[PDB]
Amino acid sequence: PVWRKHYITYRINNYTPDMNREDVDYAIRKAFQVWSNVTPLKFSKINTGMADILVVFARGAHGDDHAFDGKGGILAHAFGPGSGIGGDAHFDEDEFWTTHSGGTNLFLTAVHQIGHSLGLGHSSDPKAVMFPTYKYVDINTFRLSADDIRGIQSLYG
Ligand SMILES: CC(=O)N[C@@H]1[C@@H](O)[C@H](O)[C@@H](CO)O[C@H]1NC(=S)NCCN([C@H](C(=O)O)C(C)C)S(=O)(=O)c1ccc(-c2ccccc2)cc1
Ligand SMILES: [Ca+2]
Ligand SMILES: [Ca+2]
Ligand SMILES: [Ca+2]
Ligand SMILES: [Zn+2]
Ligand SMILES: [Zn+2]
């Protein structure tokens, strides 16, 4: 399953205290952009009503039967295309979220999760944003690998 529309809405449910709000907004907006730049998908932030993709920062158990696990391990997770909890992207508030390096990078994590929120699975390329392991890469030279692009275009392009 994939989203059956190309106008897809998202909402930040709550903000991490780790970063300035302005920076959270910008990392999340840019991570949608990465995906809208190589597909016919249009992402729109809304500030009221029910969004397709709910962006949540939470720790431990948070109401969806996938409790987080403290610092380290699981950084985040996201549900595939679907109503209700589907698409929603959650970020483990026990991580330390940063604009750049020196904790866990929100932007990079967000691009990956948004990938799952759109229906992507994982990539065997360590250059892929959908690679299953987090590592800091240079955001300045960040670009989707060809594996990411073909995956997402097989879904939406
Ligand atoms: C064969 C197998 O079962 N592998 C499964 C995949 O089938 C499946 O896509 C996924 C389902 O949970 O999990 C694979 N295995 C592992 S180890 N997944 C990583 C666990 N994280 C998940 C995730 O992938 O989003 C999340 C679903 C809990 S994670 O928290 O460790 C995580 C890992 C890497 C990143 C990341 C961040 C930035 C860039 C690249 C990756 C973010 C989160
Ligand atoms: Ca964790
Ligand atoms: Ca949803
Ligand atoms: Ca935190
Ligand atoms: Zn969750
Ligand atoms: Zn993943």
UniProtKB/Swiss-Prot annotation:
Binding site for Zn(2+) 2: H112, H116, H122
Binding site for Zn(2+) 1: H62, D64, H77, H90
Binding site for Ca(2+) 2: D52, G84, G86, D88
Record-listed Ca(2+) 3 binding positions: D69, G70, G72, I74, D92, E95
Tissue: Found in alveolar macrophages but not in peripheral blood monocytes.
Binding site for Ca(2+) 1: D18, E93, E95
Top-level division of the source organism's lineage: Eukaryota
Active site as annotated: Q113
Subcellular location: Secreted, Extracellular space, Extracellular matrix
Induction conditions: By exposure to bacterial lipopolysaccharides (LPS). Inhibited by dexamethasone.
The protein's role, per its UniProt record: May be involved in tissue injury and remodeling. Has significant elastolytic activity. Can accept large and small amino acids at the P1' site, but has a preference for leucine. Aromatic or hydrophobic residues are preferred at the P1 site, with small hydrophobic residues (preferably alanine) occupying P3.
Domain notes: The conserved cysteine present in the cysteine-switch motif binds the catalytic zinc ion, thus inhibiting the enzyme. The dissociation of the cysteine from the zinc ion upon the activation-peptide release activates the enzyme.
Family: Belongs to the peptidase M10A family.
Protein name: Macrophage metalloelastase
